[PDB]
Design a binder for this molecule. Structure first.
Ligand code: FES
Ligand code: FES
Lengths: 106, 107
């Protein structure tokens, strides 16, 4: 179990624990996080509601992104250079105590 | 005299600096020459949105009354939130010490 911090759109910081090997969507869903409309296609790589923004140093070590995730992510809202589809990212001991931000929205 | 202001740059990196009381957040970026691209285009004349800034609720909540002037300009800013304001209209006060503002996301 590792700690993960989610900075919601409201500006609030949600600190939770997730099991190694789990997807960030599994963490949100299973821990019943506040984030709205997160993980709609349930990891089918059909949407981008699981869009998460990472810290440069964590972003750099993530599994190489596939064109499948990339093509969908490129059309997502509030994109950044450190953006990834949460459902495709699984927790690693290295991600312990990291902070992921949820894309902005009025 | 001065106060501390934490600026979260677009690249996610956090840059802190100090500005004089009465100075606009725009003045802070300019004078201290912060590395925030295309920020302050119209130079505080409310003729752009490039000074858009995201604030912490506890602060945003206690800012100067939003003027229709700013509203009609802030609505054209990309990546808006419920804690956005035009940095050039926000002048530093003591209650803002050690605050953290974030530049809207942009690829
Ligand atoms: S939940 Fe749809 S791509 Fe991740
Ligand atoms: S610098 Fe243009 S509106 Fe503030």
């Amino acid at each position: 179990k590792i700690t993960v911090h989610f900075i919601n759109r409201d500006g609030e910081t949600l600190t939770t624990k997730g099991k190694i090997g789990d997807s960030l969507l599994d963490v949100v869903v299973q821990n019943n996080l506040d984030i709205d409309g997160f993980g709609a296609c349930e990891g089918t790589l059909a949407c981008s509601t699981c869009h998460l923004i990472f810290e440069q140093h964590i972003f750099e070590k993530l599994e190489a992104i596939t064109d499948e995730e990339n093509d969908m992510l490129d059309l997502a809202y509030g994109l950044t250079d450190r953006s990834r589809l949460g459902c495709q990212i699984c927790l690693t001991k290295a991600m312990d105590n990291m902070t992921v931000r949820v894309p902005d929205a009025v």
